[PDB]
């Protein structure tokens, strides 16, 4: 970077020189009227070239050389090392007229060289490198560069309710581990020359996106000073001489969203005082950029850590069977004593090179009670738009990693249920949809859920890993599979086999295979629901790059309501607890053939040959009947993807 510093007619000029720049210096304006030629002297650590109309010539410290004065003959002045107290760094120009070789006048330039660099870990190894030349840009991908910031959304200490980033203070040194390091490195003499100061600053716009803290160690112990952030746009830095570093810690306050890309900047400037009432001049400016890490969802193929479960204290069979299932794994079981754990919360995560942790997304209105150390919280509230069932997180899921027409989605794709564009039907609120879209790395896809009364994608589809492989299956609810099976069992002489055996509140209904198959209107309803399922099958195959070989159909059956929307006739088996090879599957209570549920046997016949182990989990017996509603919920918290999100190259927005 070239910077203009002119000699001044009369008075000598004193300037600060920042390493990594160089000066172009006008010696002509300072020359007396009528002067002919000039000569120069300079000190040891100042490098000086005379540039005549673009041609540069190096000049000795004391020579006698003279050059013709001319507006096109200038100096280029460079310094490679910072000044110390032992420095006299200078360039002196002598002027001569046509008569005589004794100078008629002299113009000086006195320099103080300093190093100033604002440094971040741009190369994303967790350590802060010295002046990464790419630190002011942010690029995606394996070869990409620029520093990353976490939203510091967890809570270090229980005493205050809110997440850490909601204020301007740091209570605990543990909080600093969530933060990105930024070091202002300087080198120079004991003090800056008169009239200069160093200032860190941010834009008003970014002031609600970041906060920046400096650690002091005064007498009575460590304290944390907020130097940039909400209602603080600048901080005047205390300069220390010699080779010095100031360590700062940066937190993100806000996730990427509609209208916020995730990029924020921090600057340092060397400012020069001109006079009272006159703004200070920015002599040198150095900039670093951060990208705030997105919120990321975990598909069922990822290793389970904890199984969160909600039910009533007396649903014993459910608790017993879920415990049994989880005991086959290394997972923790966590129980809260009615669908809220699945509908109100989605467990995501955030990651930066230095740190990562899980973050709960809270569905629009006690889930804030999960907020804790390295367990974060984020939520979106529609300001205007009304919330519907499609805003519940049973309607929010994510695919395994997929490749679609050569385009890779290494983190998978978020899936949310919706209605047809011209339908006037329900849709997840714009505020949540915009949030998910803005995270960018999961490239969300809308499916069609609005044919269901509750309207959730988890009612009709799920994903399971195929054991012993890198692959997965899409599981789809299928009414056609159910009718085929029931018609077979009828043909086999089982038409009088009864559903819901053991649920005493259903006994008077005496629902058999015969009764189901004879119900003409129910047949028509389910043919229509199969059309709805197949529409989704097609969009899933398209948007996930799946073929028929990747799909298994589980028997399902629905009843239609007044809105022509579906609710489960018997428990939906597709919405299952997936812990690697072990599947908790809702117990269907299907027709008993030879004292086994034919639905259970059919499902085992589909899954078991693939190495999947099926456990049927009864959540309804405690209620004595099934009306289409599930009274329990589960949510599995999983390990994050191995693939780092910053290695993705998302499509241009």
Distance between terminal CA atoms of the chain? 32
Instruction: Give the bridge partners for 94, in sequence order.
Output: 39, 106
DSSP symbols for 12-77:
-EEEEEEBTBEEEE--STTSPTT--EEEEEE-TT-EEEEEETTEEEEE-SB----EE--TTEEEEE
Q: Is 600 annotated as a binding residue?
A: no
396 is in an annotated binding site: yes
Contact flag: residue 54 with its own copies (CB under 8 A): yes
3-state helix, strand, coil in the chain (%, to 5): 20, 35, 45
Tell me if 97 contacts its own copies by CB under 8 A: no
Name the β-bridge partners of 59. 48
Residue 630 annotated as binding site: no
The CA angle 583-589-593, to the nearest 5 degrees, is 105
Closer of 217 and 276 to its own copies (Cβ): 276
The interface partner of residue 129, options being its own copies, Ca ion, none and the CB cut-off 5 to 8 Å by kind, is Ca ion
Cα angle 425, 438, 250 (rounded to 5 degrees) comes to 145
We find the least distance from the C-beta atom of residue 24 to its own copies, in angstroms, to be 6
Q: Tell me whether residue 231 or residue 491 sits nearer to its own copies (CB atom).
A: 491
Question: Buried b / exposed e across 230-268, counting CB within 10 Å, b at 16+?
Answer: beeeebebebebeeeebebbbbbbbbbbeebebbbbbbb
Q: Which is nearer to its own copies, 490 or 572 (CB)?
A: 490
Cβ-based neighbours of 358, under 8 Å, separated by 6 or more: 347, 348, 349, 374, 375, 376, 637
Pick 84 or 480: Cβ nearer its own copies: 480
Dihedral sign, Cα of residue 574, residue 579, residue 580, residue 585: negative
- Residue 564, contacted partner among Ca ion, its own copies, none, CB below 5-8 A by kind: its own copies
- For β-strands 47-52 and 55-59, DSSP reports them as antiparallel
Kindly tell me which residue out of 49, 89, 119, 175 binds Ca ion, with binding defined by CB under 5 A. Answer: 175
Q: What is the DSSP string of 210-255?
A: EEEEEEE--TT--EEEEEEBTTB-EEEEPP--EEEEEEEEEEE-S-
Question: Would you call 168 helix, strand, or coil by DSSP?
Answer: coil
User: What is the C-alpha to C-alpha distance for residues 486 and 494, in angstroms, rounded to an integer?
Assistant: 9
Is residue 419 a contact residue for its own copies (CB under 8 A)?
A: yes
Q: Tell me which DSSP letter residue 504 carries.
A: G
Tell me if 208 contacts Ca ion by CB under 5 A.
no
String of DSSP letters for 366-419: -GGGG-BTTBEEEE---SSSPP-GGGSGGGEEEPPPEEETTEEETT--EEEEE-
Out of 16, 19, 27, 28, which residue is the one contacting its own copies (CB under 8 A)?
28
Q: Judged by CB under 8 A, does residue 400 bind its own copies?
A: no
Q: How far is the CB of 145 from its own copies (least distance, A)?
A: 14
> What distance in Å separates the CA atoms of residue 324 and residue 322, rounded to the nearest whole number?
5
Can residue 363 be called a binding residue for Ca ion (CB under 5 A)? Answer: no
Q: Are strands 281-292 and 263-272 parallel, antiparallel or unpaired?
A: antiparallel
> Quick one: how far is CA 17 from the chain centroid?
39
Q: Which of 101, 102, 82, 105 is nearest to 93 (CA)?
A: 105
Is residue 156 part of an annotated ligand binding site?
A: yes
The answer to whether the CB of 247 falls within 8 A of the CB of 213 is: no
Nearer to its own copies, 305 or 523 (CB): 523
Q: Which is nearer to its own copies, 373 or 650 (CB)?
A: 650
Q: Could you say which of Ca ion, its own copies, none residue 178 binds, taking C-beta under 5 to 8 angstroms by partner kind?
A: Ca ion
- Using CB under 8 A as the binding rule, whether residue 13 contacts its own copies is answered as no
Decide: residue 134, CB within 10 A, 0-12 exposed, 13-18 middle, 19+ buried: middle
109's contact among Ca ion, its own copies, none, with CB below 5 to 8 A by partner kind, is none
What is the enclosing helix (H) or strand (E) of 141?
Answer: none
Q: How many residues form the binding site for its own copies (CB under 8 A)?
A: 68
Q: Of 221, 406, 421, 493, which one interacts with its own copies (CB under 8 A)?
A: 421
Cα–Cα dist 240/237, whole Å: 9
Q: How far is the CB of 470 from its own copies (least distance, A)?
A: 18
561: contact with its own copies by CB under 8 A: no
DSSP summary character for residue 507? G
**Of residues 96-135, those binding Ca ion (CB under 5 A):** 121, 123, 125, 127, 129
Residue pair 119/132 in contact (Cβ under 8 Å)? The answer is yes
The CB-of-616 to Ca ion minimum distance in angstroms stands at 22
Q: Does 520 bind its own copies (CB under 8 A)?
A: no
Task: Find which of Ca ion, its own copies, none residue 68 binds, CB within 5 to 8 Å per kind.
Answer: none
CA distance 294 to 150: 8
Q: Rule CB under 5 A: say whether 152 interacts with Ca ion.
A: yes
Confirm or reject binding of residue 525 to Ca ion (CB under 5 A).
no
194 binds its own copies (CB under 8 A): no
| CB 438, min distance to its own copies, A | 13
Using CB under 8 A as the binding rule, whether residue 639 contacts its own copies is answered as: no
- As measured in angstroms, the least distance from the Cβ of 428 to its own copies is 15
Q: What are phi and psi of 462, to 5 degrees?
A: -155, 175
Taking the complex as a whole, the smallest distance from the CB of residue 198 to its own copies amounts, in Å, to 12
Residue 550, annotated ligand binder?
A: no
Does 351 help bind Ca ion (rule: CB under 5 A)? no
Is 125 flagged in the annotation as binding? yes
In whole angstroms, the minimum distance from the beta carbon of 517 to its own copies comes to: 10
Our finding on whether 459 is near Ca ion (CB under 5 A) is no
548 binds its own copies (CB under 8 A): yes
Q: Please check whether residue 249 is in contact with residue 176, taking contact to mean a CB–CB distance below 8 angstroms.
A: yes
Asked if 390 is part of the footprint of Ca ion (rule: CB under 5 A), the reply reads: no
Q: Among 12, 14, 26, 382, which residue interacts with its own copies (rule: CB under 8 A)?
A: 26
* DSSP E strand stretches across 105-195: 105-120, 147-149, 180-188
Establish whether 492 is an annotated binding residue. no
Q: Is 385 labelled a binding residue?
A: no
Q: At 319, which helix (H) or strand (E)? A: helix 316-327
- Tell me the window of 51-59, 312-320, 499-507, 612-620 that interacts with its own copies (CB under 8 A): 51-59
- If the CB atoms of residues 140 and 623 are measured against its own copies, the closer one turns out to be 140
Q: Is 632 a catalytic residue?
A: yes
Binding site for Ca ion (CB under 5 A): 121, 123, 125, 127, 129, 152, 154, 164, 167, 175, 178, 374, 393, 396
Binding site for its own copies (CB under 8 A): 1-4, 6, 8-9, 24, 26, 28-29, 33-34, 51, 53-54, 71, 74, 199, 201, 203, 233-234, 259, 261, 267, 269, 271, 274-275, 277-282, 419-425, 480-481, 483-484, 487-488, 490-491, 527-528, 530-531, 534-535, 537-538, 541-542, 547-549, 553, 564, 652-653
Q: Binding site: which residues?
A: 121, 123, 125, 127, 129, 152, 154, 156, 164, 167, 169, 175, 178, 346, 374, 393, 396-397
Q: Which residues are annotated as a binding site for Ca(2+)?
A: 121, 123, 125, 127, 129, 152, 154, 156, 164, 167, 169, 175, 178, 346, 374, 393, 396-397
Residues forming the active site: 632
């Amino acid at each position: 970077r070239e910077r203009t510093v002119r000699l001044q007619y009369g008075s000598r000029v004193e300037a600060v020189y920042v390493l990594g720049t160089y000066l172009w210096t006008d010696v002509y304006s300072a020359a007396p009227a009528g002067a002919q030629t000039f000569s120069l002297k300079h000190s040891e650590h100042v490098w000086v070239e005379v540039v005549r109309d673009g041609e540069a010539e190096e000049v000795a410290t004391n020579g006698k050389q003279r050059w013709l004065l001319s507006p096109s003959t200038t100096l280029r002045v460079t310094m490679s090392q910072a000044s110390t107290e032992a420095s006299s760094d200078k360039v002196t120009v002598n002027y001569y007229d046509e008569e005589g070789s004794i100078p008629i006048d002299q113009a000086g330039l006195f320099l103080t060289a300093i190093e100033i660099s604002l440094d971040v870990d741009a190369d994303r190894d967790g350590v802060v490198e010295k002046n990464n030349p790419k630190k002011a840009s942010w690029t995606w991908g394996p070869e990409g560069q620029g520093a990353i910031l976490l939203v510091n959304c967890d809570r270090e200490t229980p005493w205050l309710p809110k997440e850490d980033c909601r204020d301007e203070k740091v209570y605990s040194k543990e909080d600093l581990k969530d933060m990105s390091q930024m070091i202002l490195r300087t080198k120079g003499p004991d003090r800056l020359p008169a009239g200069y100061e160093i200032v860190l600053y941010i834009s008003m716009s970014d002031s609600d996106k970041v906060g920046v803290f400096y650690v002091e160690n005064p007498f009575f112990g460590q304290r944390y000073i907020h130097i940039l952030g909400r209602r603080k746009l600048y901080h005047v830095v205390k300069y220390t001489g010699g080779s010095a570093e100031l360590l700062f810690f940066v937190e993100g306050l806000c996730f990427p969203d509609e209208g916020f890309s995730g990029l924020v900047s921090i600057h340092v400037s060397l400012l020069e005082y001109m006079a009272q009432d006159i703004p200070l001049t920015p002599i040198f400016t150095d900039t670093v950029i951060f990208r705030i890490a997105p919120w990321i969802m975990t598909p069922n193929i990822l290793p389970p850590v904890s199984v969160f479960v909600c039910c009533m204290k007396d649903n014993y069979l459910f608790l017993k069977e879920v415990k049994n299932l989880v005991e086959k794994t290394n997972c923790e079981l966590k129980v809260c004593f009615d669908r809220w754990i699945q509908d109100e919360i989605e467990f995501g995560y955030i990651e930066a090179p230095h740190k990562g942790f899980p973050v709960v997304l809270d569905s629009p209105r006690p889930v804030k009670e999960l907020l804790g150390p390295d367990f974060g919280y984020v939520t979106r509230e529609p300001l205007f738009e009304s919330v519907t069932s499609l805003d519940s997180f049973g309607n929010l899921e994510v695919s395994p990693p997929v490749t679609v027409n050569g385009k890779t989605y290494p983190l998978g794709r978020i899936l949310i249920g919706s209605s047809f564009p011209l339908s006037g039907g329900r849709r997840m609120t714009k505020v949540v949809r915009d949030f998910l879209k803005a995270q960018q790395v999961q490239a969300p896809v809308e499916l069609y859920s609005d044919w269901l009364t509750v309207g959730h994608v988890d009612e009709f589809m799920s994903f399971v890993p195929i054991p012993g492989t890198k692959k997965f299956l899409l599981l789809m609810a299928s009414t056609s599979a159910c009718y085929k099976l029931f018609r077979e069992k009828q043909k086999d002489g089982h038409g009088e086999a009864i559903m819901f055996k053991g649920l005493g509140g259903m006994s008077s209904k005496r629902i058999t295979i015969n009764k189901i198959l004879s119900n003409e209107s129910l047949v028509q309803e389910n043919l229509y629901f199969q059309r709805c399922l197949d529409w989704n099958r097609d969009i899933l195959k398209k948007e996930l790059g799946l073929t028929e070989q990747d799909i298994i159909d589980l028997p399902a059956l629905f009843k239609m309501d007044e809105d022509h929307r579906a609710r489960a006739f018997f428990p939906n088996m597709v919405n299952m607890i997936v812990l690697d090879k072990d599947l908790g599957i809702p117990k269907p209570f299907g027709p008993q053939v030879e004292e086994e549920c034919c639905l259970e046997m059919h499902v085992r016949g589909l899954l078991e040959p693939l190495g999947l182990e099926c456990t049927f989990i009864d959540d309804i017996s405690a209620y004595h009947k099934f009306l289409g509603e599930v009274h329990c919920g589960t949510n599995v918290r999983r390990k994050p993807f191995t693939f780092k999100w910053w290695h993705m190259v998302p499509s241009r927005r």
